Homo-oligomer: A and B are copies of this chain.
Amino acid sequence: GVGISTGTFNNQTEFKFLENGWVEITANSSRLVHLNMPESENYRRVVVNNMDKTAVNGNMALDDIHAQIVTPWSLVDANAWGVWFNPGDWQLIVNTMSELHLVSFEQEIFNVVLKTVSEPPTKVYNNDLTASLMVALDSNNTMPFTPAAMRSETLGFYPWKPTIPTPWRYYFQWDRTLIPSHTGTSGTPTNIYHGTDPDDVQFYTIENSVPVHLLRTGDEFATGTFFFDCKPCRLTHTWQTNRALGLPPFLNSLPQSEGATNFGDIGVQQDKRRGVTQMGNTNYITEATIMRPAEVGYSAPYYSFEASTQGPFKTPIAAGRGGAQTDENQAADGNPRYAFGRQHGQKTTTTGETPERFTYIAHQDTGRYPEGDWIQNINFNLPVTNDNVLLPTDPIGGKTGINYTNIFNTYGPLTALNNVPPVYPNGQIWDKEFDTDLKPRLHVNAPFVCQNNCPGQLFVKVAPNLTNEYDPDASANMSRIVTYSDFWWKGKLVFKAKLRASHTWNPIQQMSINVDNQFNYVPSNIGGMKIVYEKSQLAPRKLY
């Protein structure tokens, strides 16, 4: 009914402690989504082209060619930590728990309203009570999956501020070639957009693949409750790298007085020691030689682009880096860098139109430091001669800036690593699994990955508001009455975490407020706000 409300705004989280310390966190989100009528009621296929840019020689990475079907539908996407937990709850979940399990997820659209604008320099807005807002929910997932969180196009992270959905659009198959080159490269590299291969053509439309519901003021649509099925994320980090795995060499000479220079001592000739190693040659048994069960971490090619059918692309790393030898200044390939607008973090009161960025660097020691790597000649005669050793300092291919470690992959049967950690408050939450016959061991964008099917996509769109003049048989773009619309949105994501227990004697790391961050969690005398990213795996944990 017009004068009747059809739902309830609620943005309240709820920790429900149960038996055996397994809390049941119920995060509720409500927002006031705002929505205008499409630029055109049509589906368009468009090609983005920037030859000129990549045509520079030694500029291949700045490639941007591609094609896309530009649907007239907007997409309401709430997949991002910043939509379900304020900083206050994120500090709770991160300090006290150890593992999170995604459980359900339900959402509805209530209190819909549609209005229409009129001139002159004085616009006038009046309800159009018979108009309709279209909602459609691709539940089976006939529609291609497009996680908005990857281009900061999710929902507002502040409950007390309106928000908006993103215009949906998806990738359309296209061939394209482009040969790599540096600056000194002579001539012109084949840089061409070939076109399309019919065998891979796929044009989707909501109309034909999903049942669209029309809603009027008095209406309201609510999805069902979906239950995720997939592995538990953890909120602990490991630090033991292959070098701190096992039983330490038994010292024979323990130091006799406190002193930053009083080191105990193994006390046994490197080649007279007992133990095991994989070096059939020597009899040396050092910390870098002894034999650790397997290998934490792996070495992968850095800033290497591979390329197929549609063009060059970076070769994703799952380890990253980190360390007393990074400090974000040394931030290398691996550590993800988030760039975002005012809706999700950047100081609202901030003008100018430059994104806000931060490079997340996890607490886990499982990435590598290439500098220290090296390779010796099987014979193993040390001190190693220059001819028998290949360092990260020696050039490869003849390039001064390229070393062996730059094309090195050490990923093998004995590799062990962890899944990407949650990145509050800009990270994705769940991601759909690849429909390939052999799937990845992890997605580098999401902590959780629905095994079976992921929740479906929810699309909305303001129904066409025809005037009194209209003739389809004409080429002229139809003309509609200006009509925008506002409606409320409310989801409910429910994870089930497990409490933590202290095993150490020493206290551990804990997220906390200090005289230094103190002002990142309060608004400005203007009403300015901002959400500063938090790390999510504070406490350590034995790996072996």
Q: Which residues of B contact A511 (CB under 8 A)?
A: 507, 510
CA–CA, A12 and B446, complex, Å:
33
On whether A467 and B512 interact (CB within 8 A), knowing A202-B506, A300-B412, A387-B400, the answer reads no
Given that A292-B313, A385-B184 are known contacts, is A475 also in contact with B318, CB under 8 Å in the complex?
A: no
**From residue A357, how far is it (CB to closest CB) to chain B in Å?**
6
Q: Find chain B residues with CB under 8 A from A266 CB.
A: 48, 64
Q: In the complex, A173 Cα to B323 Cα: how many Å? A: 13
Which A residues from 242 to 272 make CB contacts under 8 A with B? 242-251, 254-259, 262-266, 270, 272
Residues of B within 8 A of A441 (CB): 413-414, 438
Q: Is the CB of B468 within 8 A of A36?
A: yes
Give A287-311 interface residues, CB cut-off 8 Å to B: 287-311
| CB-based contact B314/A274 at 8 Å | no
A210, CB-defined interface residue at 8 Å: yes
Among A101-109, A222-230, A427-435, the stretch that binds chain B is A427-435
Asked whether B60 lies within 8 Å of A412 as measured between CB atoms, the reply is no
Partner of A44, one of B203, B382, B527: B527
Q: Which residues of chain B have C-beta atoms less than 8 A from A299's C-beta? A: 306
* Given A181-B391, A246-B147, A286-B63, A95 and B510 contact (CB-CB distance below 8 Å): yes
Q: Is the CB of B343 within 8 A of A310?
A: no
Interface pair A398/B394, CB less than 8 Å apart: yes
Q: In the complex, are the beta carbons of A209 and B48 less than 8 A apart? A: no
Q: Are B239 and A200 in contact (CB under 8 A)?
A: yes
- Give per-residue flags for A112-125: 1 if the beta carbon is below 8 A from chain B beta carbons, else 0: 01010111101111
The reply to whether B286 and A61 contact each other, CB–CB distance below 8 Å, is yes
Count the copies. 3
A250 touches B307 (CB 8 A): no
Within 8 A of B (CB), among A143-195: 144-148, 150-153, 156, 159-164, 166-167, 169-175, 177-185, 194-195
Q: Which A residues between 484 and 533 are near B, CB-CB below 8 angstroms?
A: 484, 486, 488, 499, 501-515, 518, 521-529
Given A242-B313, A434-B296, answer yes or no on A46-B125 (Cβ-Cβ < 8 Å).
Answer: no
Q: How far is the CB of A430 from chain B (nearest CB, A)?
A: 11
Q: How far is the CA of A511 from the CA of B95 in the complex (A)?
A: 10
- The answer to the question of A359 belonging to the interface, with a C-beta cut-off of 8 Å to chain B, is yes
Residues from chain B with a CB closer than 8 A to the CB of A310 are: 241, 243-244, 365
* Selected contact of A209 from candidates B318, B398, B503, CB within 8 Å: B503
A125–B225 Cα gap in the complex (Å)?
41
Pick from B118, B216, B417: contact of A437, CB below 8 A: B417
Cβ-based interface call for A134 (8 A): yes
- In the complex the two chains form, is B406's CB within 8 Å of A407's CB? no
A527→B472 contact, CB < 8 A = no
Apart from A60-B384, A119-B122, A152-B275: 6 A-B pairs, beta carbons within 8 A? A2-B2, A15-B501, A68-B251, A111-B132, A151-B274, A388-B402
B301 contacts A372, CB within 8 Å? Answer: no
A-B contact pairs, 13 of them (CB 8 A): A1-B218, A2-B216, A60-B384, A142-B503, A147-B246, A150-B246, A171-B245, A198-B514, A199-B538, A241-B309, A292-B445, A318-B414, A417-B438
Among B2, B219, B354, contact of A129 (Cβ-Cβ < 8 Å): B2
On chain B, the residues within 8 Å of A376 by CB distance are 61, 303-305
Encode contact with B along A383-402: 1 for CB under 8 Å, 0 otherwise.
11111111111111111111
Contact B543 A434 (CB under 8 A): yes
Q: CB distance A294 to B316 under 8 Å?
A: yes
Question: With the chains together, A368 CA to B323 CA distance in Å?
Answer: 34
Alpha-carbon separation in the docked complex, A162 to B289 (Å): 31
Residues from chain B with a CB closer than 8 A to the CB of A458 are none
Name the B residues within 8 Å of A128 (CB-CB).
127
Whether A58 and B337, one on each chain, are in contact in the complex, defined by CB atoms closer than 8 angstroms, is no
Q: A167-B250, A444-B293, A522-B201 are contacts. A339–B276 as well, Cβ < 8 Å?
A: yes
Known: A130-B127, A337-B278, A486-B466. A505 touches B204 (CB 8 A): yes
Ranked nearest first, the 10 interchain pairs of A and B with the lowest CB-CB distance are A42-B527, A280-B331, A506-B521, A17-B21, A58-B383, A3-B218, A307-B372, A180-B374, A200-B239, A91-B507
Chain A positions 335-354 with a Cβ under 8 Å from a chain B Cβ:
335-343, 348-351, 353-354
| Contact partner, A410, options B275, B301, B410, Cβ 8 Å | B301
Residues of B within 8 A of A502 (CB): 13, 88-89, 91-92
